[PDB]
Structure formats: C-alpha cells, structure tokens
Symmetry: D2
C-alpha cells in the first residue's frame, strides 16, 4: 500500500494553500510532520511541530535540523514547497530580481538539503525505499512564458537540480530519492497575483480574460485545487515510490502535454 508509517517529514511553506493540504495528506498517511513557514505562529492541521523558518536562512535550517535530531534522529521526507513568483518585463528587470527569485526558489533547496543531509542519510538507513526529497518546480520549469523569465528560469533550475541530486545520492550509496513536482495552474493567492500583474503589464485585456485563457490551456478545463497536490507528494514520500528518482512528477491537468 501507499502509506507513510514512521516517516518523519519536514514540509516548508506549510502555512500556504498547497502547504496546508500537503501536511493534512501526509498526516492522514500517518507521517510525523515538522511544518515550517515565515509566520511566527500558525495552526497547521496535522503538524506535530510548527517552526517559524525563512528558507533563505541557513540558521533557520539549522534550527529545523536541531529539532528533528533531538526528537527523532532522522528525516525520512523533505518537501521543499516554499517558493515565490514575480511577473516582469525582462528589459525592466534588475539582475537583483533574478537573484532574489533564485535565493528563495533554488538556494533554499541547496542550503536545506545540505543542512538536513546527515538526517536524510539516517532516513536512507531506516527504509529500504530510501529517504525522499520532493522539490516543487512548476509547469513553468517545463514550458516557458512571456513575462515570467525570472520565475520559469528558477523552476527549470529546481527541476534539473532534482535530477542531479537523485543521480549523485544514488551513486554515493546514500539511499535518498530526489524528484521534482510540476503543478499546473493551482487556485492559490500566488496564481491570483500572477494573473493581476499580467493585466498590469498589459499581457491580458482583463483579469477575467487572463483567467479564462489559463483555464482553457489546461485540457482538463479548469484550475487545480490545492488538495489535488497532496496524494502525489504522499506517493513520492512513500516506499511505494522506491523505483522513482530523478523524475518529473507532473500534476498539471494535461497543460504541458498539449
């Protein structure tokens, strides 16, 4: 079966729309969940622990590692879900904007996976199927878009870092699987902000036409709900996914395949 019995999971961005659904789904599969987000206080349904955590801060990652080390002595699953977007005209975008999107979307995975690597190696010894690192990319890491250069570039970087770490951790015998997840248009405040900013830049006549165009681009014919991301993350974190590493795990309503 697909379950997370005795899985110690760290989930970042845990107070956001997708993050809360990931924590509920992982708890329903019996995971022990350390939830983290920018808010100093949060009631995340299904979290065993909540920590205030800026994923750009090595000190913040060390605090997460210290709690997991003291309470459990391993991390079995690490879900890099924290992320940002910007929507900009390339020619008006300072290099510092590219760097800021890279720092939150990519450096978070580099710093967090380095800080938690000792604990993930313990995860690799605890389960035959291995520890599991799940990196949130996007359909924007597979397919480009006008006015999303900084965001898409960062999500393609997340996708490829996932392939390289899955290959390297296997070659070094660590028994850590690494996969990228590629959501399509999910109904969250982030998608709302992207469509509003697209209208402000004059990429779309109105927010209504922007939303309709985005929906029609998905063969399934609608935005995804945050809860539609949970089962895929549970699967990847589970021993049922023991032969799944370096993979692009797509949950996009068919967006990328047409």
């Amino acid at each position: 079966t697909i379950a997370l019995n005795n899985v110690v999971a760290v989930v970042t961005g845990a107070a956001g729309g997708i993050g809360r659904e990931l924590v509920k789904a992982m708890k329903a599969a019996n995971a022990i969940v350390i939830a983290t987000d920018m808010a100093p206080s949060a009631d995340v349904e299904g979290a065993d622990h909540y920590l205030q955590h800026d994923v750009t801060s090595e000190a913040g990652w060390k605090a997460v590692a210290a709690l997991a080390q003291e309470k459990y002595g391993r991390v079995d699953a690490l879900v890099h879900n924290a992320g940002i977007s910007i929507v900009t005209k390339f020619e008006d975008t300072p290099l510092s904007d590219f760097h800021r999107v890279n720092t939150v979307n990519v450096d978070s995975i580099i710093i967090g996976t380095q800080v938690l690597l000792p604990l993930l190696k313990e995860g690799g010894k605890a389960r035959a199927g291995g520890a599991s690192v799940v990196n949130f990319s996007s359909v924007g890491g597979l397919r480009g878009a006008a006015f999303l250069a900084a965001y898409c570039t960062s999500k393609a970087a997340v996708k490829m870092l996932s392939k390289c770490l899955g290959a390297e951790f296997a070659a070094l015998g660590y028994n850590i699987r690494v996969n990228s997840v590629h959501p399509g248009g999910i109904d969250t405040p982030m998608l709302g902000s992207i469509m509003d900013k697209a209208v402000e830049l004059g990429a779309a006549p109105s927010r209504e036409v922007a939303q309709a165009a985005m929906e029609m681009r998905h063969p399934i014919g609608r935005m995804g709900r945050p809860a539609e991301m949970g089962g895929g993350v549970v699967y990847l974190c589970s021993d049922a996914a023991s032969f799944v590493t370096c993979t692009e795990f797509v949950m996009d309503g068919g967006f990328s395949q047409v």
Copy 2:
C-alpha cells in the same frame, strides 16, 4: 487518502509479471478487480473475476464489457497492461512484424477503450475525479534503442494516444482521465527475453554483460521489481489523481532523466 473504494477495475495481461502485482496492489486498495489474460483459466490473487481475453479481439472486449455491465453497471479504471516485445535487426524485420507488435500494444487500447467507453462514461459519473484509463508505455516510448525499432515505435504510439484521448475525453465532458505509464528495466520474463534476444543478435557479448550494462544505465543502480509498479497505478486510478491527465507517469529508477 489514496484508495480505490468502490472502484471497478479491468486489468489486461493480468497473469503476467507486472499484471499479478497490479491486481494485488489494487485489491489491497479495496478495488473490485476484473482480471483478463490469454489463458483459459488462472488463479490471479486478488481478482474478483477472471476472463480469458485476447486484447486484439473486439468480441473478447465485448465479453469483458458484458460482465462489468451485468455485475456493476460501470468501469471506474481500465489498465491496458497486455503487451509484447520483439528484438530484431531492422533490415531483417518485415512490415508484418511492426504490424503484429502494433496490433497487441496499440490496437488493444483503441478497440478496448472504444468497447468500454459507455461503461467508462458511467465511471465518470460515479467519481468526481473521473474514470481512469492507464496505458502501459515504456521508457522505450521516451528514448530509442538499437534493435528495438518495432517495440519502441509501438510504445511511443501508446504514449501519444494517451495524450490525445486525455485531451479529447476532457473536451467532450466525459470525465475520463487517460495517462501513460513508463516502466524502466523491470525484472520480468519480458526483460529476460529482450536480453536473451540481444545476445542471439550479437548486440551483447553475453546475458551477464547485457544485464550489468542495463543496471548501470539506471541511476538507482538496479532493475526494478514488478511490485514497484503497483503503487503508481493505484495512485493514477484513485481520486487523489483527479488533476492528472495526459501525463507521462515514469517509474524508471531515473533511466530517462540521465
């Protein structure tokens, strides 16, 4: 949760190496399983029903439809798992060899999905997430190989048919998801026959060298076990995969991503 409560599933090739593991995994998730294969009888563990079934025969598919119609009135999940391989020197391969591999690997999906479409539409009304059609492709439908022209070509056809049917069934409002599955090197009699035939053609010095080369090409560093395919198929057939259609669902130990 990821489960198949009240899911009526048809699984073809159910007596083979992967097929038997799929039926056990789907039963363990509470599916009602109609198992079919070429043998006139079979003890398939976890099958509610076994039918003798040639997937190239429209009459055979109608007998499957008749049983599901009488007992259940719907099909919630259809797993096209029946398949064949050949390994041949292209210049020695008659057109009839391409056609034979096409008839089993591709025409099976066309004929079976057409015959079961009324029952799949009833599945689409039974579950908010939709009925689910799962087509077995291969990493050979993503990446080519010397001496596997007929097989790889058929598996690329399976992959693309899956994208087109997912898009079309969504456009027509049928609520039927369609996805392709891409196994890597799985330890089954089919992979054994491919490596033996590669030696017979003189593509590999010996079965031992063929096997080692194939293992080293997978970043995870080994062949898959047939049971490692079950979780992925359960996920795709479940309501947890409600935003997953037209997708390439890869279970390949990283083979395609390096």
Copy 3:
C-alpha cells in the same frame, strides 16, 4: 559551410506545399534531386528527375532505387515528406482509419528505408558526415491534441522510429544519420483541411476562429510558410550536421516550448 555539393537526394511528396519548397532549397544548395509524388508527371522546380511513386508500395520504392542505382550508384539524402492527416472523434473512428494513416505516415518510412538501405550505405561511404534520412513528424508527434488521435499517434511513431534507426545504423557501422523534423502550423492545404474538418466536427465555431486560435498558440504569433522548412532540411542533409542523429529538429515558431 552548409551545402549539398554531390548530394543525391530522394524527396517524397515532392509535389505538395512543403515538398516543392524542399526541392527548391536543396537544388539551391547544389543537390541532385530525385522528386517523387502520386501524380504521373509534374513540373517540380529544381528536380533533376521526377517519378510517379506511391510511398505505400514496395514496387514503387524499387523503381526509385533502380533510377538512383543506374544514374548515381548511391543515395546521400532521403527525405520522407509524403504524409496524410484525418480529424475525427475517437469513438467514431474505425481501426481501419488508424491503419490507413499508419500505412502512409509510418509504413512508407519502413518500406522506403529498407529498399534504399544498400544505396544509403553507399552514401555512408561517400561522405564522412554520412548519408542523411530526414523523417517528417509534426509538433503533433511531441504534443497531443483533441480530435487528432490517429494523426498525432502516427507522428509520435515517426519520431521514435527515427531515434531507433539512428541508433541502430550507427551501432552497425553504416554511417547513416536519421533525424525527425517537427513542423508547427504551416500554411499548406493539409492545415487548411484540418481546420475545415475541425469546423465540420463542431470542434471550432468557424474557420476564422480556428485559424486565430492556432496562430495565437505559436509564440511567434503566425502560421509558418512552407519555404521556412527548407533551410532546416538542407542543414540536416549536409555534412555541417555530421554530429546530428536521433534528434528532434523542431521548426514550430515556439509552439511546443510554451
């Protein structure tokens, strides 16, 4: 330099929209061109020879081989450009319609490449870069579409057959490169017939709305012209492409990459 000095080229479908532009482009690069199509005679500008040729006929292919053998003793470039499309509702599509599209789009490449293999091996000895086989796939071989199941399936099969033949001809030491070409929406009678048939099915409100939607799906913002296919085919047929085999050569105005 990119040129086709002393290149003996066979181009099928040579009387069609793209075919005529391929023959002109290849002649402009100094190729010797054997042009073939269904019509019993034709004035194909830049053709050294015209033959009536049904690409589904082994006897037709042997007549092409006989002319090249007598006049030149080799074939340096083979461009499989002959192709057909249908636009259908899957559930109303008889298996024979899938088979008809397969016979013209895929079996043509199998039969023709087998019959011309001895002459292509002579091409492999004539140029260090090798003989060059160019197979016309489609963006429909990369991305699926509603109501194009038979066409897209055949074009994905063309794509994968190209990868397998490139790998096999290299492994056998024949020095024959094989590549697939993937046009986007090109202004030809075939695209016209697809958009008209889409209206007849009621997939599109009108031919005007169908055309506008198709144009806006291309990032470059317009249909391609048939002449925009010629340079890419010249490049692939040339010694400049000596390190290009098994490749997807895309000329789609960005369609597949968004």
Copy 4:
C-alpha cells in the same frame, strides 16, 4: 543559408567551440565582433576582437558602444562564454553555485539587456529577425552525478531562452531566441570535467571516463568543435525565421537514448 550583412557578437570566442563559431560565421559572410577574457587570441575571421568579462555590465556597454558606432545594429548575439565545475554536492559552497550562475546565466541576462536596443535595430533590418543563440548543454536536458552546479545553470539557460523568445515576440521586437545543446565535444572543458571526475573517484581513470562518455553517444564518438558551427550559422540566418524558443541539439544522439 547565409549571413550576408549580419553583424554578430560572439562571446567566449577564444575557446574550443568559440574559434570554430567565428570561422563558420565569417565563411557565411557575417561581420563578427569576437570577445573573450584574453587580451589576444588565435581567432581567425573576427572583424573586431574585444577583451570582455561577460559578468561585467561595463564590459557589455563597451561591446554595445563599438557595434553602435561601427554598424548601428546587432543582427546575431551568440552567448558562448561558459564555465564548468565538478564537485560533490555536500562539499559545494553556495558561492560555487553562484559563480557558475554568474558566468553561465547572468552573462545572458546582462548582455541581452545591454544589447537589446541594438537587437531591436536587427529586428527591423531582417524579416527573419535578430537572433540570440544561448549555449546550454545536453546537461541542461539530462542530469548527471557531480555536475549539479553546471547542469542547473545550463537548464536555467535553456528555460531563459524559451521565456525571452516568447516575450520578445509578444512585445513585437522581431528577436528570435534559441538554446543550443552540445553533447560531449572534444574541448579543454570536457577534458577538465573528465580529469576532475577521476580526482573525485567517479571514474577509475581518464581513459575509462572517456570510453564510457563515447559509448553513451549513439554515433559512438565525441564531437569536434567544428561540428557546432553550421547549427549556429543556421539559427543566426533568415533560413531559421520560424525557429524560436527551440532546443537545438547537436549531441550525437546522447539525449534521445
């Protein structure tokens, strides 16, 4: 397929591939402005050679100033400058990722922004548009152990190419943008990668590393730097007028098996 009246800027012009790109583009009649870190180079076919750090905005502005004064446009911009490292992820400081990003990706961002006015003039000069050619890698398509920093940067190059192609078309600039994906090409960079792979103990020896890499290419050998030139000429030409956002692969079949 020719580059008559094409003003081309080629970065990393003194390297293995760069020297062959300049020769190929000159042979197709381009005017070539060649740039690299070196104050001199055995670059033949360059109309102008500039010492140029592609990480420096000031360096790019000096390139723009020369093209503006001599020609008033840039028709083709080939981002070929690049570095690699080979490291164990757990031992790789964030600054190493940032250094590879600065040379491999920030170069394209800074250079394309600084040259955008001149590229818009190229967009008015040719029906097919100005052409920006970004050097990615098969490592931007497929991952590899011990190449996390390098492959990550090349996947970033690939996706930036798709976004800029889409954006410049949406804004009506008539600038095509494409990524190029070389396989294992016989250059000092591939040599450095294979040597460092041995030092980390990824390969028994340089000889075994090289043989494994050759056998991974269906064509059965490394590429020569000259085998990259025709593809870049094609993408820079009016013959490629319907080619934008594309992955232009020259890899001996590496990525497709």
